[PDB]
Amino acid sequence: GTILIDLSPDDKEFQSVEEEMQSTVREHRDGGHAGGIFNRYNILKIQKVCNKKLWERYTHRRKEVSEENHNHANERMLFHGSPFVNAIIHKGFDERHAYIGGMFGAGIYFAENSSKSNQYVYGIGGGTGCPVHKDRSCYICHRQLLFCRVTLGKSFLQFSA
Amino acid sequence: MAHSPPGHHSVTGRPSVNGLALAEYVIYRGEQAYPEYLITYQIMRPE
Ligand SMILES: CN(CCO)c1ccc([C@H]2NC(=O)c3ccccc3N2)cc1
Ligand SMILES: [Zn+2]
């Protein structure tokens, strides 16, 4: 059921997504170990993910959360990096896409910083890097991230290092 | 997959050490996210 629609670089929607990607890069405490050493990206393509069944699944849950939280879904746009990106766009997020060992328990993790999600494109801690060159800092290989609509509802605040 | 804390729908990881880091978030139900955009990119080598 999923179709992918290419956005033109001339489209305001392409431009606002690219700006969120670029502007939320930061330096990481690992010196680039997991995600590579970089300050910016070369954006090759931005595609809209269209799946009516997965969208309706999302909006159904959003309404449930909103109704439990004074009509406030607390919806954000957040990044997700994963080796299972191509599975996610076809089948949706589910327990297979959870980070079992994350700081806040086994759940599905999202980041405001695009560069944080970039650390997970090749697996936890960058895994062994790109499949072709085994380089976590590969400047050649194409990477993919998702920019996702996420319902937070009432969110538990964890202060953490 | 774990559960959200009772009476909550997600967790927010607020940075308390690194003043430049932005927040991270966790959901415990796959239905609470939709993968809107697929971005294909390279990281660029600094000059
Ligand atoms: C499917 N897995 C393997 C975990 O068992 C996975 C997928 C994505 C992530 C990952 N993806 C993220 O984008 C992310 C963002 C902020 C903080 C943590 C993050 N973790 C981690 C693990
Ligand atoms: Zn490579």
UniProtKB/Swiss-Prot annotation, chain A:
<feature type="binding site">
    <location>
        <position position="130"/>
    </location>
    <ligand>
        <name>Zn(2+)</name>
    </ligand>
</feature>
<comment type="function">
    <text>Poly-ADP-ribosyltransferase involved in various processes such as Wnt signaling pathway, telomere length and vesicle trafficking. Acts as an activator of the Wnt signaling pathway by mediating poly-ADP-ribosylation of AXIN1 and AXIN2, 2 key components of the beta-catenin destruction complex: poly-ADP-ribosylated target proteins are recognized by RNF146, which mediates their ubiquitination and subsequent degradation. Also mediates poly-ADP-ribosylation of BLZF1 and CASC3, followed by recruitment of RNF146 and subsequent ubiquitination.</text>
</comment>
<feature type="binding site">
    <location>
        <position position="141"/>
    </location>
    <ligand>
        <name>Zn(2+)</name>
    </ligand>
</feature>
<protein>
    <recommendedName>
        <fullName>Poly [ADP-ribose] polymerase tankyrase-2</fullName>
    </recommendedName>
</protein>
<feature type="binding site">
    <location>
        <position position="138"/>
    </location>
    <ligand>
        <name>Zn(2+)</name>
    </ligand>
</feature>
<comment type="similarity">
    <text>Belongs to the ARTD/PARP family.</text>
</comment>
<feature type="domain" description="PARP catalytic">
    <location>
        <begin position="8"/>
        <end position="161"/>
    </location>
</feature>
<comment type="subunit">
    <text>Oligomerizes and associates with TNKS. Interacts with the cytoplasmic domain of LNPEP/Otase in SLC2A4/GLUT4-vesicles. Binds to the N-terminus of Grb14 and TRF1 with its ankyrin repeat region. Interacts with HIF1AN. Interacts with RNF146; this interaction leads to ubiquitination and proteasomal degradation. Interacts with NUMA1.</text>
</comment>
<feature type="binding site">
    <location>
        <position position="133"/>
    </location>
    <ligand>
        <name>Zn(2+)</name>
    </ligand>
</feature>
